[PDB]
């Protein structure tokens, strides 16, 4: 995983944890596509970044993916992010990967859904923001390879990851 290539086009926008049920996974979010400001305004912080909780889910249907693609082709309305397990060290990375695979990856793929995280915009306090956590499904990698081949070449090895779509409305 070489960030030195990909960060030149799309650098990290957030670093913290994801949390659903009671299972957390420390992940760092690389920018992929869309409006980077969307991530800065959606992804909350205080110490570094409180765990993004999964409060909803989008069943990824072929029909849904069409609708998603429609708002994905308009970079401004959505933000595309790549969440990778951020470990302190190699061992820590393994543990985060392990937790992430079992808690988020397996769950999201089992549901065939999008982990929907509602965040409020700082000062606005309106949770009208949807971060869609899509599993490492073909759909995800296909768009990722088209949108960010630079970072894609790094995630091909760390396939156990999430594709997070920040959607306005």
């Amino acid at each position: 995983v070489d960030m030195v290539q990909l960060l030149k086009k799309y650098p990290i926008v957030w670093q913290g944890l994801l949390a659903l049920k009671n299972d957390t996974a420390a992940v760092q979010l690389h920018f992929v596509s869309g409006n980077n400001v969307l991530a800065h305004r959606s992804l909350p912080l205080s110490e570094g970044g409180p765990p993004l909780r999964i409060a909803q889910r989008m069943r990824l249907e072929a029909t849904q993916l069409e609708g998603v693609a429609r708002r994905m082709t308009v970079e401004t309305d959505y933000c595309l992010l790549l969440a990778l397990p951020c470990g302190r060290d190699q061992e820590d990375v393994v543990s985060q990967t392990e937790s992430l695979k079992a808690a988020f990856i397996t769950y999201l793929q089992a549901k065939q859904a999008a982990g929907i995280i509602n965040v409020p915009n700082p000062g606005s306090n309106q949770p009208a923001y949807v971060l869609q956590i899509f599993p490492p499904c073909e759909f995800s990698e296909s768009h990722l390879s088209r949108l960010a081949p630079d970072l894609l070449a790094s995630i091909s090895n760390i396939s156990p990851h999430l594709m997070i779509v920040i959607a306005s409305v």
Binding site: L20, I54, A55, Q56, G115, I116, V130
Partner: peptide, 8 residues
């Protein structure tokens, strides 16, 4: 978008 399962 349903309602998943977090901590509230």
């Amino acid at each position: 978008y349903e309602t998943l399962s977090d901590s509230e």
